[PDB]
């Protein structure tokens, strides 16, 4: 039931265009850097992963999930989710455009794993997934994730 | 059928014993070192993400999930289970003794989801839970990885 829990409106962002994958992974984690649930050195974590061993976290067409270790900055576990309507490249190859950003930040492994095994559910529903890459609003997003 | 692919008689073991947490590791991660799935340095990073911030990746308990980054050592998608009869001490609090150990390796996000959603499912069902807890010989665990 978790990720109707996680994903409230304050950390649910439509934004038309990102500058870069940088800017769309910033766009996420914000509200988790203002509300305490990570620390900045997160996000940190996570472009110098990207930078040094690549887009490894695009899961599959247009969809990423920005993470890094419980280690690397995480107080609570939490989820954001972002929609850029125009896409973003990450250079993910036929991975791109990237138009869905979910990132998860999670303190331990019982945690991680329950929150996983629901997103892989979410990644698994191509009608959600489609709602979702097509969404322009937080409440086409907070319509799809309330089954959830 | 992930599980009972990856979770063959080569990458199953069952011990009475270790000398502490960090020789539990060892011997969990061994076989995946052996032939070739993991570099012999992942198991240094999973010690060194312990000594950061502790045991986060025992799930519950009785039960281990130890793994670190594709960028500390991963080769390919790999698993290995261990039971350790008599018990380990992780200085998990009530989560301690541990006595089961499935050590997972992923190279990406995709194959990184679908294989915890896969143990999610396991550790979601207590009979097989208690089974592999009980478990006396490699025998006993692939009857349990036989429904996976």
């Not at 900045?40 to 695009?58: L, M, W």
């Amino acid at each position: 039931a978790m990720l109707k829990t996680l994903l409230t409106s304050d950390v649910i962002q439509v934004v038309s265009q990102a500058k870069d994958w940088r800017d769309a992974i910033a766009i996420s984690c914000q509200p988790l850097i203002d509300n305490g649930a990570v620390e900045a050195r997160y996000v940190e974590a996570i472009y110098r992963s990207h930078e040094a061993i690549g887009p490894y976290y695009v899961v599959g067409p247009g969809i990423a999930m920005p993470h890094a270790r419980p280690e690397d900055g995480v107080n609570r576990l939490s989820l954001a989710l972002t929609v850029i309507t125009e896409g973003v490249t990450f250079n993910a190859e036929g991975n791109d455009p990237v138009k869905l950003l979910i990132v998860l930040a999670a303190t331990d492994s019982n945690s991680h794993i329950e929150a996983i095994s629901q997103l892989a559910q979410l990644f698994d529903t191509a009608s959600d997934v489609q709602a979702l890459l097509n969404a322009k609003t937080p409440q086409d997003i907070l319509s799809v994730i309330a089954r959830y």
